[PDB]
Design an enzyme around this catalytic site. Structure first.
Site: not given
Ligand SMILES: CC(=O)N[C@@H]1[C@@H](O)[C@H](O[C@@H]2O[C@H](CO)[C@@H](O)[C@H](O)[C@H]2NC(C)=O)[C@@H](CO)O[C@H]1O
Ligand SMILES: CC(=O)N[C@@H]1[C@@H](O)[C@H](O)[C@@H](CO)O[C@H]1O
Ligand SMILES: CC(=O)N[C@@H]1[C@@H](O)[C@H](O)[C@@H](CO)O[C@H]1O
Ligand SMILES: CC(=O)N[C@@H]1[C@@H](O)[C@H](O)[C@@H](CO)O[C@H]1O
Ligand SMILES: [Cl-]
Ligand SMILES: [Cl-]
Length: 528
Positions: A288, A364, A284, A286
């Site tokens: 990101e 999510y 898989d 992944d």
């Molecule tokens: C839409 C979006 O995802 N905005 C950003 C956040 O996702 C991102 O936080 C992180 O999201 C991930 C999910 O895709 C989590 O697994 C991750 O843990 C989470 N942040 C932290 C610090 O754990 C943040 C950064 O924190 O930025 C947003 O813009």
């Protein structure tokens, strides 16, 4: 007749992959082997040594040779258990030794017994078998969360995704790891003396070394999550298990894979990894994310990454096809992807799906405690009742993929088994908390801002609960602390099941399996 042969005592447990239970570096951790050499030696009592000697495995001949040597060496290629006997013959006839049990272990679990799921919490038998039902199991959940593989409701899953397999690399290459105390240091140990861009294991202790139910013997060949997965596969022969490479903090090396040299090292490492760890049924991907906006802000280049992603998928599929031909097995290739339309736009998924069997839409984390200002549904199917113009929704994400030409069959919808939320939310109106502003993240089960679904239920009385039937989304609020939490509930999950059915999607997947009490997974398997 020759004298009766008696086999000398010996350690007769062999392993086609040897584990060093003290190692911390991946390269000292495993010793993969072409074959195993079964050794037998004997003595003869009350008669002659015989004119010829045979070795029998379950009364099948596997060796003939000199009776006088009183020793045999037999090459074994596959795992399993069997009785070994020495048989001595002369013109008169034969005498046979008492048997000894020989055990050859390997990572397909051929030396193991099934590890069956005992039904815990609210989990209930019944699996939706005409859809993909997948869940992520996190490697590190064996610690504080106390959720080892044996607690996973595998009879209700078609697919189990192991998060996460790391890519080797230090400074510049896995900097995202540095946001989590000790996490980057831990990976450096695991990759000590290992070439950058090769796959490894992040926590070999949790992966293979830690004693767990049914793999805790003193001389156990494979322990940890991996040992448990080999055994659990025997108990659940329907299940496919996938190593998931990357995730939020382990994605950085992908950004370097426009370079074919590094990409080659990576793909070859993956090929070797699957030959070493036979219980995995594919891979898989992944990443990101192609284009950036992941854990590391420095990274990302849209045109370049979109092509890297396609090239990487193509090469993985071609490698997996070689494995298929070579082993007779069927290997899957999947990818977890952002459900944000702005990340979806980076990639040509119509081209990507030519290499991918499934796409795990990460529907999510739409909203969260990274911002006190942007309050909203962390997960949801449709736009909220109070904001019909929200684009960060499952429906919009799916529509965007369809518009690109993705087969709806390959789309798997994500279910969060946790909530994201804010504390002290004030300066709002008309009890619409989502027009307020937060004063920080809600206090969290394991990390702050995030709450296990199981903790949410246990805490229900502290909260006023709301379903938004237009959006198909749920949340809770506690004026007492100003606590606002958006999460997937039985209601919203059933919403997602309806949505998947209506649009003929591939199925659903949950992140992460340890946070459920069985409610959500039951709901996922609901059949209408
Ligand atoms: C839409 C979006 O995802 N905005 C950003 C956040 O996702 C991102 O936080 C992180 O999201 C991930 C999910 O895709 C989590 O697994 C991750 O843990 C989470 N942040 C932290 C610090 O754990 C943040 C950064 O924190 O930025 C947003 O813009
Ligand atoms: C490490 C180990 O496996 N030790 C041996 C095993 O090989 C042997 O088969 C058994 C008796 O047969 O006694 C155990 O002590
Ligand atoms: C790894 C494992 O536990 N079982 C696999 C099984 O998935 C596969 O169908 C079969 C085909 O040869 O090979 C076994 O080793
Ligand atoms: C992390 C974040 O909040 N991103 C926002 C999202 O909320 C919004 O719904 C959408 C608008 O196009 O995309 C981003 O601007
Ligand atoms: Cl070591
Ligand atoms: Cl050996």
């Amino acid at each position: 007749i020759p004298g009766t042969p008696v086999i000398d005592w010996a350690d007769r447990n062999y392993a086609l992959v040897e584990i060093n239970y003290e190692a911390t570096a991946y390269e000292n951790l495993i010793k993969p082997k072409e074959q195993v050499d079964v050794q037998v030696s004997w003595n003869v009592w009350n008669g002659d040594i015989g004119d010829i000697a045979y070795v029998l495995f379950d009364e099948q001949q596997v060796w003939k040779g000199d009776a006088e040597s009183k020793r045999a060496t037999i090459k074994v290629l596959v795992s399993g258990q069997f009785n070994m006997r020495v048989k001595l013959c002369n013109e008169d006839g034969c005498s046979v030794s008492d048997p000894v049990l020989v055990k050859v272990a390997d990572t397909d679990g051929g030396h193991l017994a099934p590890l069956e799921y005992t039904w815990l919490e609210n989990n209930k038998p019944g699996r939706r078998e005409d859809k993909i039902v997948a869940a992520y199991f996190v490697e590190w959940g064996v610690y504080g969360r106390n959720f080892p593989v044996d607690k996973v409701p595998l009879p209700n899953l078609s697919h189990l995704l192991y998060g996460f397999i790391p890519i080797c690399g230090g400074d510049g290459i896995n900097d995202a790891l540095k946001t989590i105390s000790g996490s980057f240091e831990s990976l450096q140990r695991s990759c000590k003396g290992r070439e950058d861009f090769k796959v490894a294991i992040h926590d070999p202790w949790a992966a293979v070394q830690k004693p767990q139910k049914s793999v805790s013997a003193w001389n156990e060949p494979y322990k940890g999550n991996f040992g448990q997965l080999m055994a659990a596969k025997l108990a659940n022969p329907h299940l496919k298990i996938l190593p998931s490479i990357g995730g939020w903090t382990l994605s950085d090396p992908f950004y370097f894979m426009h370079d074919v040299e590094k990409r080659n090292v990576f793909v070859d490492s993956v090929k070797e990894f699957l030959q070493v760890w036979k219980f995995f049924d594919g891979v898989d991907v992944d990443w990101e994310f192609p284009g950036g906006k992941g854990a590391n802000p420095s990274l990302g280049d849209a045109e370049r990454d979109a092509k890297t992603y396609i090239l990487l998928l193509e090469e993985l599929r071609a490698m997996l096809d070689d494995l298929e031909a070579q082993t007779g097995r069927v290997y899957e290739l999947t990818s977890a992807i952002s459900a944000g339309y702005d990340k979806i736009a980076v990639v040509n998924y119509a081209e990507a799906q030519k290499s991918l069997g499934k796409i795990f839409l990460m529907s999510y984390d739409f909203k969260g405690a990274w911002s006190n200002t942007d309050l909203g549904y962390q997960t949801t199917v449709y736009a909220p009742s109070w904001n019909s113009e929200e684009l960060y929704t499952t429906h919009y994400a799916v529509d965007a993929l369809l518009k690109q030409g993705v087969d709806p069959n390959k789309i798997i919808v994500g279910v969060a088994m946790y909530g994201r939320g804010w504390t002290g939310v004030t300066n709002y109106t008309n009890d619409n908390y989502f027009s307020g502003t937060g004063n920080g993240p809600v206090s969290g089960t394991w990390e702050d801002g995030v709450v296990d679904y199981r903790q949410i239920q246990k805490d229900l009385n502290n909260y006023v609960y709301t379903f938004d039937s237009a959006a198909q989304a749920s949340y809770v609020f506690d004026k007492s602390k100003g606590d606002l939490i958006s999460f997937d509930s039985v209601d919203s999950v059933l919403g997602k099941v309806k949505y998947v059915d209506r649009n003929k999607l591939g199925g659903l997947f949950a992140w992460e399996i340890d946070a459920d009490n069985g409610d959500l997974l039951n709901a996922i398997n609901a059949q209408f």
